[PDB]
Design a protein around this motif. Structure first.
Motif, PDB file in Angstrom:
ATOM      1  N   UNK B   5       0.823  -1.203   0.000  1.00  0.00           N
ATOM      2  CA  UNK B   5       0.000   0.000   0.000  1.00  0.00           C
ATOM      3  C   UNK B   5       0.860   1.256   0.000  1.00  0.00           C
ATOM      4  N   UNK B   6       2.004   1.221   0.683  1.00  0.00           N
ATOM      5  CA  UNK B   6       2.934   2.342   0.693  1.00  0.00           C
ATOM      6  C   UNK B   6       3.872   2.336  -0.506  1.00  0.00           C
ATOM      7  N   UNK B   7       3.849   1.280  -1.322  1.00  0.00           N
ATOM      8  CA  UNK B   7       4.677   1.212  -2.517  1.00  0.00           C
ATOM      9  C   UNK B   7       3.879   1.022  -3.799  1.00  0.00           C
ATOM     10  N   UNK B   8       2.572   0.788  -3.717  1.00  0.00           N
ATOM     11  CA  UNK B   8       1.743   0.707  -4.909  1.00  0.00           C
ATOM     12  C   UNK B   8       1.733   2.048  -5.644  1.00  0.00           C
ATOM     13  N   UNK B   9       1.249   2.009  -6.889  1.00  0.00           N
ATOM     14  CA  UNK B   9       1.305   3.159  -7.782  1.00  0.00           C
ATOM     15  C   UNK B   9      -0.059   3.558  -8.337  1.00  0.00           C
ATOM     16  N   UNK B  10      -1.159   3.078  -7.754  1.00  0.00           N
ATOM     17  CA  UNK B  10      -2.464   3.177  -8.399  1.00  0.00           C
ATOM     18  C   UNK B  10      -3.551   3.847  -7.569  1.00  0.00           C
ATOM     19  N   UNK B  11      -3.508   3.773  -6.242  1.00  0.00           N
ATOM     20  CA  UNK B  11      -4.663   4.149  -5.427  1.00  0.00           C
ATOM     21  C   UNK B  11      -4.257   5.107  -4.312  1.00  0.00           C
ATOM     22  N   UNK B  12      -5.004   6.188  -4.085  1.00  0.00           N
ATOM     23  CA  UNK B  12      -4.779   7.005  -2.887  1.00  0.00           C
ATOM     24  C   UNK B  12      -5.442   6.394  -1.662  1.00  0.00           C
ATOM     25  N   UNK B  33      13.118   9.921  16.150  1.00  0.00           N
ATOM     26  CA  UNK B  33      13.823   8.664  16.370  1.00  0.00           C
ATOM     27  C   UNK B  33      13.342   7.567  15.429  1.00  0.00           C
ATOM     28  N   UNK B  34      12.038   7.498  15.173  1.00  0.00           N
ATOM     29  CA  UNK B  34      11.507   6.542  14.212  1.00  0.00           C
ATOM     30  C   UNK B  34      11.745   7.053  12.797  1.00  0.00           C
ATOM     31  N   UNK B  35      12.290   6.187  11.941  1.00  0.00           N
ATOM     32  CA  UNK B  35      12.696   6.598  10.602  1.00  0.00           C
ATOM     33  C   UNK B  35      12.363   5.552   9.545  1.00  0.00           C
ATOM     34  N   UNK B  36      11.482   4.599   9.843  1.00  0.00           N
ATOM     35  CA  UNK B  36      11.101   3.592   8.862  1.00  0.00           C
ATOM     36  C   UNK B  36      10.484   4.251   7.634  1.00  0.00           C
ATOM     37  N   UNK B  37      10.977   3.865   6.455  1.00  0.00           N
ATOM     38  CA  UNK B  37      10.465   4.428   5.209  1.00  0.00           C
ATOM     39  C   UNK B  37       9.004   4.058   4.990  1.00  0.00           C
ATOM     40  N   UNK B  38       8.610   2.853   5.402  1.00  0.00           N
ATOM     41  CA  UNK B  38       7.238   2.395   5.209  1.00  0.00           C
ATOM     42  C   UNK B  38       6.241   3.270   5.964  1.00  0.00           C
ATOM     43  N   UNK B  39       6.419   3.389   7.280  1.00  0.00           N
ATOM     44  CA  UNK B  39       5.532   4.233   8.073  1.00  0.00           C
ATOM     45  C   UNK B  39       5.627   5.699   7.667  1.00  0.00           C
ATOM     46  N   UNK B  40       6.835   6.202   7.417  1.00  0.00           N
ATOM     47  CA  UNK B  40       6.976   7.615   7.074  1.00  0.00           C
ATOM     48  C   UNK B  40       6.351   7.954   5.722  1.00  0.00           C
ATOM     49  N   UNK B  41       6.367   7.017   4.772  1.00  0.00           N
ATOM     50  CA  UNK B  41       5.652   7.204   3.511  1.00  0.00           C
ATOM     51  C   UNK B  41       4.145   7.041   3.650  1.00  0.00           C
ATOM     52  N   UNK B  42       3.686   6.169   4.546  1.00  0.00           N
ATOM     53  CA  UNK B  42       2.277   6.196   4.929  1.00  0.00           C
ATOM     54  C   UNK B  42       1.884   7.566   5.474  1.00  0.00           C
ATOM     55  N   UNK B  43       2.671   8.084   6.416  1.00  0.00           N
ATOM     56  CA  UNK B  43       2.363   9.374   7.021  1.00  0.00           C
ATOM     57  C   UNK B  43       2.330  10.493   5.991  1.00  0.00           C
ATOM     58  N   UNK B  44       3.346  10.581   5.128  1.00  0.00           N
ATOM     59  CA  UNK B  44       3.370  11.709   4.200  1.00  0.00           C
ATOM     60  C   UNK B  44       2.096  11.741   3.369  1.00  0.00           C
ATOM     61  N   UNK B  45       1.666  10.584   2.862  1.00  0.00           N
ATOM     62  CA  UNK B  45       0.412  10.539   2.120  1.00  0.00           C
ATOM     63  C   UNK B  45      -0.742  10.963   3.015  1.00  0.00           C
ATOM     64  N   UNK B  46      -0.688  10.572   4.289  1.00  0.00           N
ATOM     65  CA  UNK B  46      -1.699  10.998   5.249  1.00  0.00           C
ATOM     66  C   UNK B  46      -1.491  12.452   5.664  1.00  0.00           C
ATOM     67  N   UNK B  47      -0.264  12.963   5.567  1.00  0.00           N
ATOM     68  CA  UNK B  47       0.038  14.325   5.992  1.00  0.00           C
ATOM     69  C   UNK B  47      -0.225  15.386   4.930  1.00  0.00           C
ATOM     70  N   UNK B  48      -0.407  15.003   3.666  1.00  0.00           N
ATOM     71  CA  UNK B  48      -0.544  15.992   2.602  1.00  0.00           C
ATOM     72  C   UNK B  48      -1.585  17.048   2.954  1.00  0.00           C
ATOM     73  N   UNK B  49      -1.237  18.307   2.689  1.00  0.00           N
ATOM     74  CA  UNK B  49      -2.115  19.447   2.942  1.00  0.00           C
ATOM     75  C   UNK B  49      -2.620  19.447   4.383  1.00  0.00           C
TER      76      UNK B  49
END
Lengths: 49, 49
Positions: B5-12, B33-49
């Protein structure tokens, strides 16, 4: 940071990807015009078919 | 998986505002302290605007 460019999981061909093909037809057009110049002169010296 | 879900290319994707899920992903995303790419990329999509 993400290298995941999403859009290009396959796709149709683009005119600018096909440009190299049209170059062959263009070279043929140019070369046939050039060759036509040579007969267009020489038939003036033959005065006959 | 959430990796997909954090690496797919099709769905918001997203969730309800102010939810304990939203806040959980924030705790995994904004934390220094937490720096996992998976969670942080989940967050950014959740953080937009």
């Amino acid at each position: 940071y993400s290298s995941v460019d999403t859009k290009q999981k396959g796709g149709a061909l683009d005119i600018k990807s096909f440009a190299g093909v049209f170059c062959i037809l263009a070279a043929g057009i140019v070369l046939s015009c050039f060759i036509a110049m040579l007969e267009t002169w020489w038939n003036k010296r033959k005065g006959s078919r | 998986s959430l990796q997909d879900l954090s690496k797919q290319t099709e769905i918001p994707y997203g969730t309800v505002l102010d939810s304990a899920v939203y806040e959980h992903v924030r705790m995994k995303g904004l934390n220094p302290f937490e720096r996992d790419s998976m969670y942080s990329q989940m967050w950014r999509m959740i953080n937009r605007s």
